[PDB]
Amino acid sequence: GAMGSMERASLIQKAKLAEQAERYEDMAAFMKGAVEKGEELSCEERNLLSVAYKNVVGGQRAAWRVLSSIEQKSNEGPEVREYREKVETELQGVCDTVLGLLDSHLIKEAGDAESRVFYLKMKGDYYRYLAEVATDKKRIIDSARSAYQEAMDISKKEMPPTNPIRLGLALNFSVFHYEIANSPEEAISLAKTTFDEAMADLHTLSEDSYKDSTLIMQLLRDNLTLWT
Amino acid sequence: GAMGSMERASLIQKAKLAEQAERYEDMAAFMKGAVEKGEELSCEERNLLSVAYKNVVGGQRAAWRVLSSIEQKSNEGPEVREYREKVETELQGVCDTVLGLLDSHLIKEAGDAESRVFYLKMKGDYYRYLAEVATDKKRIIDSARSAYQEAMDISKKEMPPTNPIRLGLALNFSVFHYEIANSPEEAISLAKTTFDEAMADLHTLSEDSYKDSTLIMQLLRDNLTLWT
Amino acid sequence: TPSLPX
Amino acid sequence: TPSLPX
Numbered sequence: 001g002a003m004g005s006m007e008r009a010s011l012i013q014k015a016k017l018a019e020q021a022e023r024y025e026d027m028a029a030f031m032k033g034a035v036e037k038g039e040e041l042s043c044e045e046r047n048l049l050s051v052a053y054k055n056v057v058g059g060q061r062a063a064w065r066v067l068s069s070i071e072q073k074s075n076e077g078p079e080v081r082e083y084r085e086k087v088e089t090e091l092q093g094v095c096d097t098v099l100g101l102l103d104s105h106l107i108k109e110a111g112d113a114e115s116r117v118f119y120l121k122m123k124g125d126y127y128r129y130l131a132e133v134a135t136d137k138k139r140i141i142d143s144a145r146s147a148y149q150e151a152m153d154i155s156k157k158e159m160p161p162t163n164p165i166r167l168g169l170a171l172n173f174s175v176f177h178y179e180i181a182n183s184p185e186e187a188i189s190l191a192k193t194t195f196d197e198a199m200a201d202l203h204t205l206s207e208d209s210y211k212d213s214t215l216i217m218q219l220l221r222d223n224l225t226l227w228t
Numbered sequence: 229g230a231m232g233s234m235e236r237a238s239l240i241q242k243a244k245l246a247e248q249a250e251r252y253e254d255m256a257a258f259m260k261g262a263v264e265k266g267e268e269l270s271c272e273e274r275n276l277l278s279v280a281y282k283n284v285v286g287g288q289r290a291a292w293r294v295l296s297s298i299e300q301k302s303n304e305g306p307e308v309r310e311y312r313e314k315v316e317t318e319l320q321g322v323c324d325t326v327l328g329l330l331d332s333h334l335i336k337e338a339g340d341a342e343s344r345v346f347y348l349k350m351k352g353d354y355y356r357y358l359a360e361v362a363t364d365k366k367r368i369i370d371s372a373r374s375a376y377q378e379a380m381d382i383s384k385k386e387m388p389p390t391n392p393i394r395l396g397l398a399l400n401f402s403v404f405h406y407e408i409a410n411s412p413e414e415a416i417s418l419a420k421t422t423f424d425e426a427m428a429d430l431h432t433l434s435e436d437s438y439k440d441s442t443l444i445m446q447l448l449r450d451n452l453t454l455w456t
Numbered sequence: 457t458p459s460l461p462x
Numbered sequence: 463t464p465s466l467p468x
């Protein structure tokens with residue numbers, strides 16, 4: 001694409017600069033260019049990819065929620081609907097872009113459990129964002145579920161219960177159950193079992209790993225408190 | 229442009245929606261479309277134009293400052309300079325866009341003191357932002373000064389000393405003196421005389437106007453405290 | 457519900 | 463120095 005002439009290392013370097021400047025659209029374009037070099041991503045590079053697109057779609061989703069709320073209140077001219085549709089289409093485009101990167105060809109080249117779970121968790125997230133605005137909706141929801149489920153199966157087989165990627169996967173799959181699948185009891189069960197199994201494995205961890213895991217465990221507990 | 233097919237009223241309506249969604253790039257594009265309909269802007273519409281582009285360039289300037297600081301620390305490969313230049317060019321492009329709207333043809337059609345001072349203050353601001361990154365620099369600085377000065381001359385002739393537009397003009401012209409023109413004593417004098425002349429005119433104001441004026445007066449005082 | 461930031 | 467917001 002437009003990053004095709006820039007060195008892989010320079011794209012990564014500029015993605016890190018863009019993050020420091022809170023220029024997340026730039027950051028995402030740089031990381032897209034880096035992915036499209038065809039090489040697998042390191043752990044740090046996977047995090048950069050995730051941070052970049054998470055922040056881009058996060059702004060879009062928050063905008064979409066504001067406009068949809070106005071649109072709904074208006075139903076109790078076409079401008080509100082039109083502009084909501086404009087944001088929604090740009091949001092779907094970014095989701096399609098990320099899902100395209102995962103399908104071409106990050107996932108199929110990810111053989112290590114940590115990278116494969118990482119990308120499958122991302123796939124579930126971005127189908128979940130598509131589901132938030134969908135009204136093919138059932139197929140989109142099942143795509144999110146299938147991606148999360150494959151990631152869960154690998155993570156439970158290959159990674160300790162305190163692993164941050166596994167914990168973050170479980171947190172977001174539980175949110176999917178609660179917010180998308182209308183399965184609040186499944187969400188609660190998943191978050192509780194995840195929290196309890198990580199608690200029992202904390203004793204194996206260094207101080208630094210302890211901090212990483214307990215941070216995510218607290219977010220699991222926060223949601224359980226909200227849900228119960 | 230790309231907004232040429234949308235009604236003026238719809239552009240204004242969507243600019244207000246974009247502000248609520250904190251989508252300031254959209255907001256600016258909508259207000260650009262509205263300006264390019266050729267009609268003069270109301271007071272509320274002038275504020276929408278200002279809010280939109282202020283937020284867009286504000287993000288660019290903050291990004292530019294982050295990258296320039298890194299670039300400077302690096303001087304004690306080309307990626308840092310390149311990316312700083314990328315942001316700087318996009319920043320200059322938005323400044324050129326706003327200045328083009330003012331020159332074509334907002335300023336020449338502004339006959340009322342409040343609208344004319346408003347646009348000339350904007351002209352000074354956006355030349356000031358160009359000066360922040362300039363290394364024609366003297367001509368850019370004098371363009372900012374000339375625009376601010378014409379606005380000052382009109383505001384002192386046509387508007388009470390508590391008028392928010394006049395106060396905001398004086399605040400930003402004083403910042404220009406301190407940060408751009410290397411004239412800290414002129415900045416301090418201007419802010420002090422502005423504060424004192426507004427204080428003496430507060431007794432004429434309603435409760436609501438009192439609040440508007442004293443809010444800006446407090447920012448004048450904040451800068452004087454920083455400067456002394 | 458809040459999801460996993462970053 | 464802080465300028466006039468908005």
Ligand SMILES: *N1CCC[C@H]1C(c1ccccc1)c1ccccc1
Binds near residue numbers: 051119121165460
């Ligand atoms: N957000 C910042 C770092 C990556 C990302 C999540 C995450 C991504 C993919 C799979 C699981 C989690 C994360 C990872 C570790 C710690 C906090 C957040």
Ligand SMILES: *N1CCC[C@H]1C(c1ccccc1)c1ccccc1
Binds near residue numbers: 274279349350397
């Ligand atoms: N930022 C929000 C409203 C307009 C703008 C400034 C301002 C613009 C142009 C000339 C003078 C001031 C403003 C105006 C009134 C109150 C606060 C800020």
Ligand SMILES: [Cl-]
Binds near residue numbers: 082242
């Ligand atoms: Cl629209």
Ligand SMILES: [Cl-]
Binds near residue numbers: 014310314
């Ligand atoms: Cl660049």
Ligand SMILES: [Mg+2]
Binds near residue numbers: 185
């Ligand atoms: Mg129950």
Ligand SMILES: [Mg+2]
Binds near residue numbers: 413
């Ligand atoms: Mg002195």
Ligand code: NA
Binds near residue numbers: 007008
């Ligand atoms: Na290369």
Ligand code: NA
Binds near residue numbers: 077078079238241
């Ligand atoms: Na309308």
Ligand code: NA
Binds near residue numbers: 085088089
């Ligand atoms: Na749609």
Ligand code: NA
Binds near residue numbers: 113158159160
């Ligand atoms: Na393992």
Ligand code: NA
Binds near residue numbers: 235236
């Ligand atoms: Na019309």
Ligand code: NA
Binds near residue numbers: 305307
């Ligand atoms: Na380099």
Ligand code: NA
Binds near residue numbers: 313
């Ligand atoms: Na330049």
Ligand code: NA
Binds near residue numbers: 387
């Ligand atoms: Na007057």
